[PDB]
């Protein structure tokens, strides 16, 4: 589902990529080879969101931006990889955590599913990890595919 009464303005700003579950071994392995710093959520010129991710790969800071186009329900977006993917904010309290769920909506990407835990703080919090694990299990992810991403304190400004 999608967060009821979703308020995009309260969702903006700095988030940390704390947890990930995916059914793609290729994707999990790619993510495991890097360390996340922060992500920034900001309104895009198209009415959706820009998600700008900063991370460390081989001790170099890198940034990548993804355009999340509005998908016609608040909290629901579409991403086209330069397959198309639905991206939903399933649950958030805005000031501590957000649970996102993505899956392919067109093309061979339809095989793809991913849950993401974002946190307003970088430091792990057991209750948030439990919430994420419960969500991933409910969405059919196996335990072994529910992982908590290595963080970095670099790249932060």
Ligand X SMILES: CCCCCCCCCCCCCCCC(=O)O
Ligand Y SMILES: CCCCCCCC/C=C\CCCCCCCC(=O)O
Chosen residue from 64, 106, 125, 137 binding ligand Y by CB under 6 A: 64
Least distance in angstroms from the C-beta of 18 to ligand X:
15
Q: How far apart are CA 82 and CA 124, in angstroms?
A: 32
Is residue 67 within 8 Å of residue 48, measured between CB atoms? yes
**DSSP structure class, residue 48:** S
In the complex with ligand Y, which residue's Cβ is closer, 60 or 127? 60
As beta bridge partners, residue 77 has 70, 87
Select the binding partner of residue 35 from ligand Y, ligand X, none (C-beta < 5 to 8 A, by kind): none
Lookup: tokens for 40? 């920034």
Residues of this chain, 51-110, that bind ligand X according to CB under 6 A: 79, 81, 85, 87, 102, 109
53 binds ligand Y (CB under 6 A): yes
Question: Which residues have a Cβ under 8 Å from the Cβ of 95 and sit 6 or more positions away?
Answer: 10, 120
Q: Which residues bind ligand Y (CB under 6 A)?
A: 27, 30-31, 34, 53, 55, 64, 66, 114
């Amino acid at each position: 589902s999608v967060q009821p009464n979703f308020q995009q303005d309260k969702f903006l700003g700095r988030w940390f990529s704390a947890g990930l579950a995916s059914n793609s071994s290729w994707l999990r392995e790619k993510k495991a080879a890097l360390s996340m710093a922060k992500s920034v959520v900001a309104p895009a010129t198209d009415g959706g969101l820009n998600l700008t991710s900063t991370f460390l790969r081989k001790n170099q800071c890198e940034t990548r931006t993804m355009l999340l186009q509005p998908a016609g329900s608040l909290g629901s977006y579409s991403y086209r990889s330069p397959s198309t993917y639905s991206v939903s904010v399933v649950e958030t309290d805005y000031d501590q955590y957000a649970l996102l769920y993505s899956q392919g909506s067109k093309g061979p990407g339809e095989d793809f599913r991913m849950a993401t835990l974002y946190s307003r703080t970088q430091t792990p919090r057991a209750e948030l990890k439990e919430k994420f694990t419960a969500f991933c299990k409910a969405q059919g992810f196996t335990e072994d595919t529910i992982v908590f991403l290595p963080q970095t304190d670099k790249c932060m400004t």
